Design an enzyme around this catalytic site. Structure first.
Site, PDB file in Angstrom:
ATOM      1  N   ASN A 212       3.691   1.787   2.701  1.00  0.00           N
ATOM      2  CA  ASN A 212       2.768   2.804   2.176  1.00  0.00           C
ATOM      3  C   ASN A 212       1.337   2.627   2.700  1.00  0.00           C
ATOM      4  OD1 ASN A 212       2.238   0.483   0.512  1.00  0.00           O
ATOM      5  ND2 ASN A 212       1.362   1.839  -1.055  1.00  0.00           N
TER       6      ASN A 212
ATOM      7  N   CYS B   5      -1.252   1.100   1.429  1.00  0.00           N
ATOM      8  CA  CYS B   5      -1.794  -0.253   1.216  1.00  0.00           C
ATOM      9  C   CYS B   5      -0.905  -1.444   1.656  1.00  0.00           C
ATOM     10  CB  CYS B   5      -2.192  -0.405  -0.252  1.00  0.00           C
ATOM     11  SG  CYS B   5      -3.418   0.815  -0.757  1.00  0.00           S
TER      12      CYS B   5
ATOM     13  N   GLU C 239       2.301  -2.569   0.926  1.00  0.00           N
ATOM     14  CA  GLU C 239       2.815  -3.297  -0.255  1.00  0.00           C
ATOM     15  C   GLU C 239       4.170  -2.798  -0.768  1.00  0.00           C
ATOM     16  OE1 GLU C 239       1.239  -2.108  -3.935  1.00  0.00           O
ATOM     17  OE2 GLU C 239      -0.186  -0.661  -3.108  1.00  0.00           O
TER      18      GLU C 239
END
Ligand SMILES: Nc1ncnc2c1ncn2[C@H]1C[C@H](O)[C@@H](COP(=O)(O)O)O1
Ligand SMILES: Nc1ncnc2c1ncn2[C@H]1C[C@H](O)[C@@H](COP(=O)(O)O)O1
Lengths: 672, 670
Positions: B363, B365, B367
């Site tokens: 995604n 970020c 994670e």
């Protein structure tokens, strides 16, 4: 008509004694002749300082940038500060050793470009880095002969990488040995000293899909580059320990012997224990321990694990007599001078950064004693695991001039500042573990010299309880103000050494002795020597503890005493904290000879200048032990022996040193 | 009115010295001024809770439904539980960041409608879904600051979509790219980050501009802001990899350039193997693989098929140097901070649901690491093949306050319950694959924060083995009770994520690690921290294994550590599991400035709050890998660099992360 120069004739007239005393007057006449009839007749002419610097900068003698941080008006003021003193060399060897070895000369290596004042001024301008008033203090410090930067820093500063003295750590593999050899070549040319730790390497008779093989490869490599020498250290519990010691046998073979490499032996307390109680000892094949336990033999505590290595069938061993191996050390130390001895637990029992690592080995002169971690160099250079090697730049206080100027605080702090600058300006490229060490550990090595010369000129015998009482107080103060400055630098910069949080400085365990007991002098004679200087009390150390705790410390290590064989002549000092070998030193000049009385020798103090070989080495061990108290690294301890002493007599000295907490033992000097 | 307000004047007096020490006392005065001289003089008056809630429901501030599930006597008690704590913000930025960025205000953005206690009560009444006693439990959990829901959940709960993390597959067709942009903008409007997988799209040369064409077209839509950001991931064995990387350059050619879109690179082990042995590497054209072999490239296994692709004369290729291309990735991260690296096999070696698909990307970020299947959108609606996209609603627990209260089970259980209710309540309308996967997978993202703040306040260095020893035991316990709660919910609801029966939870391979090898603390210093709460033994894991086997598991994925930026201020916590950047944080207010000493910083613990740039990044990689053992998705891992490091040094760090099993590495800060 007569070929022998007038200054040599005048120097030799010291020995042609009249009355019932040596003519110590004649050396002041001899050095005067050396200047007016030679040195001043071979100095390159310039109209002024403007022409002199522009010549040296444009002809690639001096470096470009360090000068450009000052205006020329301030450079003239700094140079003028050096010449203001009108410093005069008291002896022929003082002037000779500077102008022969240290003073800059022309490319047609004949004519003199630098005076004693010009060297000091340039070095002072290099340290201060733009601060003109700081350079003036560095000039006053160096021209009064309160501080003396080490040979490599004093010689090369300002010219066209200052830090000599490196300690590498070799891992058990061909890539690691091959890189350790290649890195030793790069550090051989850059200054000099390289010291390898071979305790990690596997023994002879362990195959791959001994340590002498590496020592021969090193010796050949150091010989290939015509340029300072190297050294190798090995733990006494290593299997090849005998073959390692046999490289400096006087009756050795041509291929097995090493010329360039010095050798050191690291002795844990467990080896002395086995000797005391007359048991047999076992030396180990370290790779069999590695496969079994996971850790290297050199990284594990031998006082806990020795018995477990013996009882384990998976670990390969070799039965030996420890008492006979101690005799073999003494034999070789008598015969050749080697090896150097390190008492590992006498280093590590007082060591601040055990949490980083135990001190496993030392350097070329047995002085630098720091933590270190092994590297792992692979075929693909981007997958390497870089560790912690050791690099340390040096410098020495002049005990005599520091005491008389009453500058025991200031001289330590400026020295510490200059050493920090040399540490900051160091750029090592082809030794990533050495580069990471310099950034992270920020180690320096402030030693001292002229201990005997000070004591002898104040009517104090070197081996008395008075002399040891002075050194106790003096070197306590050196440690106090070194720690104080390390915290002051850590405050001013906001930086500390890597993993400061874990050290005994941070936990407060370092200060326990200085908080509890008082190191001011017992004898009233010695209390008066420190008159005009505040001796730190227990209450001061409590404040210094709290100051360090709050602001941290920039330096992992600070103090170490070097041998200082040559620069001591420039300073007119007795070499290091050692006693003196000869009252008069007869040395070859060039078909003629020169004589050098020890500094301040006279009929008043002839017996206070007692020759080192005539002393009780037990009482000399007591002096180094009391000094060692306030030096967080080591001291280069030369033993001075007689041809009459048995190998039984030498073991008694070596083991008394261990008993008294001595960290390292250097070259063994013997006399007829 | 026009001078520097008192609360900032007091805040600035922290930097003024007293006895060579900072004045950390002054920030407690700075908050008290902020409340007395501002917040208490800008709260809207209501006589009682009934008139307050009625007004907010009537005027379209709060939502109608969730409150109606309770009686008013219950709602009164739930609010009264929040005010019973007497919660006081310790630092200025804690109170400010809440009341300025989170607390509900009047339509003209002026006056405050919610206190901190009012926000938590509404969020707790939302989560609990009518269970009044559980609502009380949620209030305690959030106001003792044991648990903190994510920004989008915490801000929007019970007002006029709460999920705001999306990952989309993109199929090899213009018509599929049309819906990819269409869905991305629909989901970006609500504030969420949207990541795309461009590895299936055909490269330039294959006829119908390439993946750069989709990035540039997507970037222009995102750049039209009057709402959240966007990202794009690409496999390293794709020819446009070098054009993809050129978008985020220092000297960026404006035609092939990207402002808004973050970029990621997915790297299998086979590429790292080629760099090590120093063979020349072949990047591929994907639509030639699709025609010849019958599957998409990133769906196939590169460790098996790389030699087979090179031997095949029909499949088109382009030869490159792998050793130089890793140095390019390092250079760009030193310049721009991009790209993100995903070590694909470090994800899929430990991935439970490989049978659904292997994890191909991440995604915004770096994670969320979940299985995904491509969709096929066509000219006729009824012939669309709706695949599996990824959404993930987030939250994270407070490592300091969880340990103090000894509530490591209770917080993980309830946090997992709260995330499940958001997962259930999500109603995504215009993303058909995202809707389908929310129903099928039922995944959540329970993370953690305040790791350094906890370690530093107990005299434990971030880089020490003592710290790793805590992290090993802590995040194991999190994983134990998260798996347990997932099985408990699976029994209570009588439901399981689609194709659970195929997962390593069902087959029992997942628990192999934990049924042997005891994860108690080695060091006794660390063992004494967990005193008063039970550390799961190997026998406890053996019983969990069987309990999972009998009753199944509700959630597909449970744990991911997000980079908790803004909400960590509210919690008075250090951000994420990361180390701290600055001991004291200086930020501009508006021609004045503010100061935030990291929470719990004192004169004595100063050197345990080491700045991340001063740390050895190899020792940080070891800390993250230690945690990664017990987190089934990924960890947002910022690498903290100084400018004195070469591309030689940064390339050595990135490979060490791969070597230690790190899944994702994020933005590189300097
Ligand atoms: N002993 C000594 N040390 C250093 N420099 C010396 C010495 N003797 C002479 N000189 C040099 C230094 C001056 O340039 C000059 C002064 O000679 P003079 O007649 O001696 O004052 O000669
Ligand atoms: N730090 C902090 N957080 C939240 N509300 C605060 C704070 N300081 C003052 N106040 C407000 C809350 C109440 O209206 C009142 C209680 O003051 P007190 O002196 O705090 O009892 O002041």
């Amino acid at each position: 008509q007569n070929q022998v120069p007038k200054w040599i004739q005048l120097n030799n007239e010291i020995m042609i004694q009249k009355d019932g005393k040596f003519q110590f007057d004649k050396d002041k006449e001899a050095v005067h002749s050396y200047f007016v009839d030679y040195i001043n007749q071979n100095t390159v002419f310039f109209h002024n300082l403007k022409e002199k610097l522009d010549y040296l900068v444009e002809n690639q003698y001096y470096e470009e940038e360090f000068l450009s941080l000052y205006s020329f008006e301030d450079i003239k003021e700094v140079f003028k500060t050096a010449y203001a003193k009108k410093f005069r060399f008291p002896s022929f060897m003082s002037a000779f050793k500077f102008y022969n070895d240290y003073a800059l000369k022309t490319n047609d290596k004949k004519k003199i470009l630098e005076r004693y004042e010009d060297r000091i001024s340039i070095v002072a301008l290099f340290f201060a880095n733009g601060d003109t008033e700081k350079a003036k203090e560095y000039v006053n410090l160096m021209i009064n002969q309160e501080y003396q930067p080490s040979t490599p820093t004093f010689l090369n500063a300002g010219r066209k990488e200052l830090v000599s003295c490196f300690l590498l750590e070799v891992n058990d593999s061909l890539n690691d040995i091959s890189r350790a050899i290649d890195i030793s070549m790069q550090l051989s040319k850059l200054g000099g000293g390289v010291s390898l730790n071979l305790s990690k390497l596997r023994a002879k008779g362990e195959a791959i899909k001994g340590v002498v093989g590496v020592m021969k490869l090193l010796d050949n490599a150091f010989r290939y580059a015509d340029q300072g020498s190297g050294a190798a250290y090995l733990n006494i519990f290593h299997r090849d320990i005998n073959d390692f010691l046999d490289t400096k046998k006087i009756s050795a073979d041509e291929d097995v012997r090493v010329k360039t490499l010095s050798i050191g032996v690291v002795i844990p307390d467990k080896f002395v224990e086995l000797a005391r109680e007359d048991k047999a000892a076992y030396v180990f094949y370290p790779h069999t321990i590695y496969k079994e336990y996971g850790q290297h033999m050199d990284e594990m505590d031998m006082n806990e694990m020795y018995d477990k290595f013996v009882d384990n069938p998976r670990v390969k061993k070799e039965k030996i007599n420890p008492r006979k191996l101690l005799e073999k050390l003494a034999m070789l130390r008598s015969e050749s001078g080697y090896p150097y001895i390190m008492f590992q637990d006498n280093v590590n029992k007082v060591h601040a950064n055990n949490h980083i690592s135990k001190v496993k080995f030392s350097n070329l002169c047995s002085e630098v004693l720091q933590a270190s971690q092994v590297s792992s160099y692979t075929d693909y250079d981007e997958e390497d695991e870089i560790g912690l090697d050791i690099s340390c730049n040096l410098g020495s206080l002049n005990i005599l001039n520091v005491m008389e100027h009453k500058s025991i605080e200031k001289t330590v702090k400026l020295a510490t500042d200059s050493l920090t600058h040399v540490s900051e300006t160091t750029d090592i490229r082809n030794a990533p573990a050495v580069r990471r060490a310099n950034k992270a550990m920020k180690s320096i090595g402030l030693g001292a010299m002229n201990l005997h010369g000070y004591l002898a000129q104040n009517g104090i015998a070197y081996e008395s309880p008075e002399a040891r009482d002075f050194a106790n107080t003096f070197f306590m103060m050196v440690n106090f103000y070194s720690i104080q400055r390390s915290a002051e630098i850590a405050k001013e910069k906001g930086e500390t050494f890597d993993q400061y949080e874990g050290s005994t400085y941070a936990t407060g365990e370092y200060f326990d002795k200085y908080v509890s007991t008082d190191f001011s002098p017992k004898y009233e004679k010695i209390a008066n020597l420190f008159e005009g200087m505040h001796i730190p009390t227990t209450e001061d150390w409590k404040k210094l503890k709290a100051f360090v705790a709050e602001h941290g410390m920039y330096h992992s290590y600070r103090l170490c005493i070097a041998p200082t064989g040559s620069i001591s002549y420039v300073q007119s000092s007795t070499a290091s904290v050692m006693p003196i070998m000869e009252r008069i030193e007869e040395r070859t000049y060039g078909n003629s000879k020169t004589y050098y009385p020890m500094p301040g020798l006279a009929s008043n103090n002839w017996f206070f200048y007692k020759e080192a070989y005539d002393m009780d080495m037990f009482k000399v061990v007591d002096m180094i032990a009391t000094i060692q108290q306030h030096i967080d690294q080591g001291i280069s301890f030369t033993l001075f022996l007689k041809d009459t002493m048995t190998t039984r007599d030498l073991n008694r000295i070596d083991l008394y040193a261990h008993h008294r907490g001595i960290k390292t033992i250097y070259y063994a000097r013997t006399k007829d």
